[PDB]
Write a protein that binds this DNA or RNA. Structure first.
Ligand code: NA
Ligand code: NA
Ligand code: NA
Ligand code: NA
Length: 328
DNA sequence: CCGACAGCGCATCAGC
DNA sequence: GCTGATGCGT
DNA sequence: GTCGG
Protein backbone atom coordinates (compact mmCIF):
# COMPACT_ATOMS: atom_id res chain seq x y z
CA UNK A 1 0.00 0.00 0.00
CA UNK A 2 2.42 2.72 -1.19
CA UNK A 3 2.13 6.16 0.41
CA UNK A 4 -0.12 8.48 -1.56
CA UNK A 5 2.69 11.07 -1.62
CA UNK A 6 4.43 8.76 -4.17
CA UNK A 7 2.16 9.37 -7.16
CA UNK A 8 -0.92 10.93 -5.54
CA UNK A 9 -0.70 13.94 -7.83
CA UNK A 10 -1.01 11.65 -10.85
CA UNK A 11 -3.71 9.41 -9.40
CA UNK A 12 -5.73 12.46 -8.25
CA UNK A 13 -5.50 13.85 -11.80
CA UNK A 14 -6.61 10.57 -13.40
CA UNK A 15 -9.53 10.22 -10.95
CA UNK A 16 -10.71 13.77 -11.65
CA UNK A 17 -10.52 13.10 -15.39
CA UNK A 18 -12.46 9.87 -14.74
CA UNK A 19 -15.30 11.74 -13.04
CA UNK A 20 -15.70 14.25 -15.88
CA UNK A 21 -15.79 11.42 -18.43
CA UNK A 22 -18.53 9.68 -16.42
CA UNK A 23 -20.61 12.69 -15.33
CA UNK A 24 -20.17 15.29 -18.10
CA UNK A 25 -19.03 13.56 -21.31
CA UNK A 26 -21.15 10.45 -20.57
CA UNK A 27 -18.25 8.17 -21.60
CA UNK A 28 -18.41 5.37 -19.04
CA UNK A 29 -15.66 3.31 -20.70
CA UNK A 30 -13.22 6.22 -20.55
CA UNK A 31 -14.22 6.73 -16.91
CA UNK A 32 -13.23 3.12 -16.28
CA UNK A 33 -10.05 3.43 -18.36
CA UNK A 34 -8.95 6.34 -16.16
CA UNK A 35 -9.93 4.48 -12.97
CA UNK A 36 -7.95 1.44 -14.10
CA UNK A 37 -4.92 3.62 -14.79
CA UNK A 38 -5.23 5.34 -11.41
CA UNK A 39 -5.50 1.96 -9.63
CA UNK A 40 -2.45 0.41 -11.29
CA UNK A 41 -0.46 3.58 -10.57
CA UNK A 42 -1.74 3.78 -6.99
CA UNK A 43 -0.13 0.34 -6.50
CA UNK A 44 3.18 1.12 -8.21
CA UNK A 45 5.79 1.24 -5.42
CA UNK A 46 7.97 3.84 -7.16
CA UNK A 47 7.74 7.58 -7.70
CA UNK A 48 6.97 7.83 -11.42
CA UNK A 49 9.61 9.81 -13.32
CA UNK A 50 8.12 9.86 -16.84
CA UNK A 51 5.05 8.97 -18.86
CA UNK A 52 7.11 6.30 -20.60
CA UNK A 53 7.75 4.67 -17.24
CA UNK A 54 4.03 4.66 -16.49
CA UNK A 55 3.20 3.40 -20.00
CA UNK A 56 4.80 0.07 -19.04
CA UNK A 57 1.92 -0.51 -16.60
CA UNK A 58 -1.15 -2.36 -17.96
CA UNK A 59 -3.97 0.13 -18.48
CA UNK A 60 -1.68 3.13 -19.01
CA UNK A 61 -1.60 4.01 -22.69
CA UNK A 62 -0.22 6.66 -25.01
CA UNK A 63 -2.58 9.46 -23.97
CA UNK A 64 -2.24 9.01 -20.23
CA UNK A 65 1.56 8.81 -20.56
CA UNK A 66 1.33 12.13 -22.42
CA UNK A 67 -0.75 13.63 -19.61
CA UNK A 68 1.73 12.34 -17.02
CA UNK A 69 4.58 14.07 -18.87
CA UNK A 70 2.64 17.34 -18.84
CA UNK A 71 1.81 16.92 -15.14
CA UNK A 72 5.41 16.10 -14.19
CA UNK A 73 6.85 19.09 -16.08
CA UNK A 74 4.23 21.68 -15.09
CA UNK A 75 2.47 20.38 -11.98
CA UNK A 76 -0.92 20.60 -13.69
CA UNK A 77 -2.91 19.62 -16.77
CA UNK A 78 -4.27 22.44 -18.96
CA UNK A 79 -7.37 20.47 -19.95
CA UNK A 80 -8.22 19.68 -16.33
CA UNK A 81 -7.58 23.22 -15.13
CA UNK A 82 -9.96 24.48 -17.83
CA UNK A 83 -12.81 22.12 -17.10
CA UNK A 84 -12.46 22.82 -13.34
CA UNK A 85 -13.18 26.52 -14.07
CA UNK A 86 -16.08 25.67 -16.36
CA UNK A 87 -19.33 26.64 -14.65
CA UNK A 88 -21.67 24.22 -16.41
CA UNK A 89 -19.23 21.29 -16.42
CA UNK A 90 -18.28 21.64 -12.74
CA UNK A 91 -21.95 21.94 -11.70
CA UNK A 92 -22.98 18.88 -13.74
CA UNK A 93 -20.09 16.91 -12.22
CA UNK A 94 -21.08 18.06 -8.73
CA UNK A 95 -24.79 17.30 -8.99
CA UNK A 96 -24.14 13.64 -9.83
CA UNK A 97 -22.91 13.23 -6.24
CA UNK A 98 -26.62 13.14 -5.31
CA UNK A 99 -27.76 9.52 -5.29
CA UNK A 100 -30.42 9.27 -7.99
CA UNK A 101 -28.96 12.10 -10.08
CA UNK A 102 -27.03 10.56 -12.96
CA UNK A 103 -25.41 12.29 -15.94
CA UNK A 104 -28.76 12.79 -17.71
CA UNK A 105 -30.57 14.40 -14.75
CA UNK A 106 -27.54 16.52 -13.84
CA UNK A 107 -27.32 17.80 -17.43
CA UNK A 108 -31.03 18.63 -17.45
CA UNK A 109 -30.86 20.46 -14.13
CA UNK A 110 -27.85 22.55 -15.11
CA UNK A 111 -29.51 23.29 -18.47
CA UNK A 112 -32.43 24.92 -16.62
CA UNK A 113 -30.23 26.77 -14.14
CA UNK A 114 -30.36 24.30 -11.24
CA UNK A 115 -26.69 24.01 -10.24
CA UNK A 116 -26.29 23.61 -6.45
CA UNK A 117 -27.86 21.74 -3.55
CA UNK A 118 -29.63 24.96 -2.58
CA UNK A 119 -31.17 25.04 -6.07
CA UNK A 120 -32.25 21.41 -5.67
CA UNK A 121 -33.64 22.26 -2.24
CA UNK A 122 -35.71 25.00 -3.94
CA UNK A 123 -37.11 22.68 -6.65
CA UNK A 124 -38.45 19.58 -4.86
CA UNK A 125 -41.26 19.05 -7.39
CA UNK A 126 -38.59 18.43 -10.05
CA UNK A 127 -36.99 15.56 -8.09
CA UNK A 128 -38.17 11.96 -8.12
CA UNK A 129 -38.44 9.96 -4.88
CA UNK A 130 -34.92 8.52 -5.03
CA UNK A 131 -33.40 11.95 -5.72
CA UNK A 132 -35.24 13.57 -2.77
CA UNK A 133 -33.75 10.94 -0.46
CA UNK A 134 -30.30 11.40 -1.97
CA UNK A 135 -30.58 15.15 -1.44
CA UNK A 136 -31.93 14.71 2.09
CA UNK A 137 -28.94 12.57 3.08
CA UNK A 138 -26.30 14.06 0.75
CA UNK A 139 -23.69 14.47 3.48
CA UNK A 140 -24.45 11.25 5.36
CA UNK A 141 -24.22 9.16 2.19
CA UNK A 142 -20.68 10.44 1.57
CA UNK A 143 -19.46 9.34 5.02
CA UNK A 144 -17.94 5.92 5.58
CA UNK A 145 -19.21 3.48 8.21
CA UNK A 146 -16.73 2.35 10.91
CA UNK A 147 -16.62 -1.40 11.42
CA UNK A 148 -17.90 -1.05 15.00
CA UNK A 149 -21.08 0.56 13.66
CA UNK A 150 -21.30 -2.11 10.96
CA UNK A 151 -21.19 -4.68 13.77
CA UNK A 152 -24.04 -2.91 15.64
CA UNK A 153 -25.98 -2.66 12.40
CA UNK A 154 -25.43 -6.39 11.78
CA UNK A 155 -26.65 -7.20 15.31
CA UNK A 156 -29.99 -5.53 14.55
CA UNK A 157 -30.40 -7.08 11.08
CA UNK A 158 -29.62 -10.61 12.25
CA UNK A 159 -31.81 -10.32 15.35
CA UNK A 160 -34.87 -8.96 13.54
CA UNK A 161 -34.52 -11.39 10.61
CA UNK A 162 -34.46 -14.34 13.02
CA UNK A 163 -37.41 -12.82 14.90
CA UNK A 164 -39.51 -12.83 11.71
CA UNK A 165 -38.61 -16.45 10.95
CA UNK A 166 -35.76 -18.41 12.56
CA UNK A 167 -35.35 -20.36 9.30
CA UNK A 168 -34.21 -17.26 7.40
CA UNK A 169 -30.47 -17.12 6.66
CA UNK A 170 -28.92 -13.66 6.44
CA UNK A 171 -25.32 -12.72 5.59
CA UNK A 172 -23.76 -9.25 5.61
CA UNK A 173 -21.31 -9.37 2.72
CA UNK A 174 -19.09 -6.80 1.05
CA UNK A 175 -15.67 -5.79 2.30
CA UNK A 176 -17.11 -5.90 5.82
CA UNK A 177 -17.32 -9.69 5.57
CA UNK A 178 -13.67 -9.71 4.46
CA UNK A 179 -12.78 -7.92 7.70
CA UNK A 180 -12.49 -4.33 6.51
CA UNK A 181 -12.22 -1.56 9.09
CA UNK A 182 -14.79 0.65 7.33
CA UNK A 183 -17.58 0.20 4.80
CA UNK A 184 -19.41 2.38 2.32
CA UNK A 185 -22.80 0.75 2.90
CA UNK A 186 -24.36 -2.48 4.16
CA UNK A 187 -25.09 -5.37 1.77
CA UNK A 188 -27.39 -8.06 3.18
CA UNK A 189 -28.04 -11.35 1.37
CA UNK A 190 -31.18 -13.14 2.52
CA UNK A 191 -32.55 -16.61 1.87
CA UNK A 192 -35.09 -19.10 3.26
CA UNK A 193 -35.46 -22.88 2.67
CA UNK A 194 -38.95 -22.31 1.22
CA UNK A 195 -37.49 -20.26 -1.69
CA UNK A 196 -35.67 -22.10 -4.46
CA UNK A 197 -35.06 -21.49 -8.16
CA UNK A 198 -37.87 -23.89 -9.03
CA UNK A 199 -40.89 -23.12 -6.84
CA UNK A 200 -42.39 -20.21 -4.86
CA UNK A 201 -43.18 -13.84 -2.78
CA UNK A 202 -43.51 -11.96 0.53
CA UNK A 203 -40.29 -13.28 2.14
CA UNK A 204 -38.43 -10.03 1.50
CA UNK A 205 -41.31 -7.72 2.45
CA UNK A 206 -41.70 -9.33 5.89
CA UNK A 207 -38.06 -8.62 6.74
CA UNK A 208 -38.14 -5.02 5.44
CA UNK A 209 -41.36 -4.47 7.38
CA UNK A 210 -39.89 -5.67 10.68
CA UNK A 211 -36.77 -3.55 10.26
CA UNK A 212 -39.04 -0.55 9.65
CA UNK A 213 -41.18 -1.48 12.67
CA UNK A 214 -38.17 -1.27 15.01
CA UNK A 215 -37.22 2.01 13.28
CA UNK A 216 -33.96 0.74 11.81
CA UNK A 217 -34.94 1.25 8.16
CA UNK A 218 -35.93 4.90 7.77
CA UNK A 219 -36.45 5.33 3.98
CA UNK A 220 -36.99 3.25 0.85
CA UNK A 221 -35.25 4.00 -2.44
CA UNK A 222 -36.73 0.96 -4.20
CA UNK A 223 -38.34 -2.33 -3.27
CA UNK A 224 -39.47 -5.31 -5.28
CA UNK A 225 -39.96 -9.03 -4.67
CA UNK A 226 -36.22 -9.79 -4.62
CA UNK A 227 -34.33 -6.53 -3.98
CA UNK A 228 -34.66 -3.73 -1.44
CA UNK A 229 -32.53 -0.59 -1.47
CA UNK A 230 -32.93 2.00 1.23
CA UNK A 231 -31.69 3.89 4.26
CA UNK A 232 -31.13 2.92 7.89
CA UNK A 233 -29.86 4.47 11.10
CA UNK A 234 -28.57 3.10 14.38
CA UNK A 235 -30.45 4.34 17.46
CA UNK A 236 -28.58 7.10 19.28
CA UNK A 237 -27.93 6.69 22.98
CA UNK A 238 -30.06 8.82 25.31
CA UNK A 239 -28.72 12.40 25.11
CA UNK A 240 -26.10 11.97 22.39
CA UNK A 241 -25.37 13.07 18.81
CA UNK A 242 -27.32 10.96 16.32
CA UNK A 243 -25.63 8.48 14.01
CA UNK A 244 -25.50 9.32 10.28
CA UNK A 245 -28.07 7.72 8.00
CA UNK A 246 -26.64 4.80 6.02
CA UNK A 247 -27.36 3.00 2.76
CA UNK A 248 -28.52 -0.61 3.14
CA UNK A 249 -29.41 -3.10 0.40
CA UNK A 250 -31.25 -6.35 1.11
CA UNK A 251 -31.47 -9.03 -1.61
CA UNK A 252 -33.61 -12.18 -1.49
CA UNK A 253 -31.86 -15.10 -3.18
CA UNK A 254 -33.10 -18.65 -3.89
CA UNK A 255 -31.55 -21.14 -1.47
CA UNK A 256 -29.88 -23.11 -4.29
CA UNK A 257 -28.13 -19.93 -5.51
CA UNK A 258 -27.45 -18.39 -2.09
CA UNK A 259 -23.82 -19.38 -1.63
CA UNK A 260 -22.79 -18.38 -5.16
CA UNK A 261 -24.29 -15.01 -4.22
CA UNK A 262 -22.42 -14.77 -0.91
CA UNK A 263 -19.15 -15.62 -2.66
CA UNK A 264 -19.69 -13.02 -5.38
CA UNK A 265 -20.93 -10.23 -3.14
CA UNK A 266 -18.11 -10.83 -0.65
CA UNK A 267 -15.50 -10.20 -3.34
CA UNK A 268 -13.16 -8.53 -3.66
CA UNK A 269 -13.70 -7.70 -7.34
CA UNK A 270 -10.11 -8.79 -8.04
CA UNK A 271 -10.62 -12.07 -6.20
CA UNK A 272 -13.78 -12.73 -8.22
CA UNK A 273 -12.02 -12.17 -11.55
CA UNK A 274 -9.28 -14.64 -10.60
CA UNK A 275 -11.66 -17.31 -9.32
CA UNK A 276 -13.69 -17.06 -12.52
CA UNK A 277 -10.47 -17.47 -14.51
CA UNK A 278 -9.31 -20.45 -12.44
CA UNK A 279 -12.82 -21.89 -12.87
CA UNK A 280 -12.70 -21.64 -16.67
CA UNK A 281 -9.37 -23.43 -17.05
CA UNK A 282 -10.80 -26.14 -14.76
CA UNK A 283 -13.90 -26.51 -16.95
CA UNK A 284 -16.45 -24.56 -14.88
CA UNK A 285 -18.39 -21.36 -15.43
CA UNK A 286 -19.21 -19.37 -12.28
CA UNK A 287 -21.55 -16.38 -12.19
CA UNK A 288 -23.43 -14.61 -9.39
CA UNK A 289 -26.02 -17.40 -9.37
CA UNK A 290 -24.49 -20.78 -10.27
CA UNK A 291 -21.47 -22.90 -11.19
CA UNK A 292 -21.85 -25.06 -14.28
CA UNK A 293 -19.67 -27.57 -16.13
CA UNK A 294 -18.50 -26.84 -19.67
CA UNK A 295 -18.38 -29.67 -22.20
CA UNK A 296 -15.44 -30.06 -24.55
CA UNK A 297 -17.22 -27.89 -27.18
CA UNK A 298 -18.07 -25.16 -24.63
CA UNK A 299 -21.70 -26.15 -24.01
CA UNK A 300 -22.68 -25.18 -20.47
CA UNK A 301 -24.41 -27.96 -18.56
CA UNK A 302 -26.95 -27.78 -15.77
CA UNK A 303 -25.93 -25.91 -12.59
CA UNK A 304 -24.11 -27.98 -9.95
CA UNK A 305 -25.48 -28.35 -6.40
CA UNK A 306 -23.92 -25.83 -3.99
CA UNK A 307 -24.62 -25.86 -0.24
CA UNK A 308 -21.71 -23.76 1.05
CA UNK A 309 -19.00 -21.49 -0.26
CA UNK A 310 -16.56 -24.38 0.11
CA UNK A 311 -18.65 -26.50 -2.29
CA UNK A 312 -17.69 -23.95 -4.97
CA UNK A 313 -13.97 -24.03 -4.14
CA UNK A 314 -14.09 -27.84 -4.15
CA UNK A 315 -15.52 -28.02 -7.69
CA UNK A 316 -12.52 -26.10 -9.03
CA UNK A 317 -10.06 -27.83 -6.63
CA UNK A 318 -9.11 -24.55 -5.00
CA UNK A 319 -8.44 -24.65 -1.28
CA UNK A 320 -11.15 -22.78 0.60
CA UNK A 321 -9.87 -19.33 1.44
CA UNK A 322 -11.11 -17.17 4.28
CA UNK A 323 -12.99 -13.97 3.38
CA UNK A 324 -10.12 -12.08 5.05
CA UNK A 325 -7.83 -13.75 2.47
CA UNK A 326 -9.88 -12.75 -0.62
CA UNK A 327 -8.17 -9.42 -1.28
CA UNK A 328 -6.91 -10.95 -4.55
C1' DC B 1 -8.99 -1.19 -37.52
C1' DC B 2 -12.52 -1.34 -34.48
C1' DG B 3 -15.45 -3.89 -30.91
C1' DA B 4 -15.40 -4.94 -25.75
C1' DC B 5 -15.25 -2.82 -21.65
C1' DA B 6 -21.27 -7.44 -17.16
C1' DG B 7 -25.56 -8.28 -16.03
C1' DC B 8 -29.51 -7.09 -13.80
C1' DG B 9 -33.63 -5.03 -10.45
C1' DC B 10 -36.44 -1.41 -9.92
C1' DA B 11 -38.56 3.23 -11.07
C1' DT B 12 -39.89 5.77 -14.62
C1' DC B 13 -40.29 7.23 -19.23
C1' DA B 14 -41.69 6.72 -24.25
C1' DG B 15 -44.44 4.69 -27.49
C1' DC B 16 -48.46 2.48 -28.90
C1' DG C 1 -53.94 0.38 -20.10
C1' DC C 2 -49.63 -2.54 -21.68
C1' DT C 3 -44.72 -3.37 -23.43
C1' DG C 4 -40.28 -2.29 -24.10
C1' DA C 5 -36.51 1.44 -23.43
C1' DT C 6 -33.98 4.30 -20.57
C1' DG C 7 -31.73 6.09 -16.28
C1' DC C 8 -29.70 4.77 -12.38
C1' DG C 9 -27.06 2.28 -9.00
C1' DT C 10 -24.34 -1.49 -8.15
C1' DG D 1 -8.70 5.47 -23.30
C1' DT D 2 -6.71 0.95 -23.52
C1' DC D 3 -6.39 -3.51 -24.94
C1' DG D 4 -6.17 -7.08 -28.25
C1' DG D 5 -8.33 -10.25 -32.03
NA1 NA E 1 0.45 0.24 -20.61
NA1 NA F 1 -22.50 9.76 -8.03
NA1 NA G 1 -25.69 10.24 -8.53
NA1 NA H 1 -39.08 -20.75 14.15
Amino acid sequence: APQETLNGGITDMLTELANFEKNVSQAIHKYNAYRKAASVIAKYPHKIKSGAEAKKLPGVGTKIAEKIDEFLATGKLRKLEKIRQDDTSSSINFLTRVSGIGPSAARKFVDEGIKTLEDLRKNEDKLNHHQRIGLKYFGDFEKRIPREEMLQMQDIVLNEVKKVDSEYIATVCGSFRRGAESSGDMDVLLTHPSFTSESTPKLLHQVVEQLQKVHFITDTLSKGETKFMGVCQLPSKNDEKEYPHRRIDIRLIPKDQYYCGVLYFTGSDIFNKNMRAHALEKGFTINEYTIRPLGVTGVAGEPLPVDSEKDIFDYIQWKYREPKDRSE
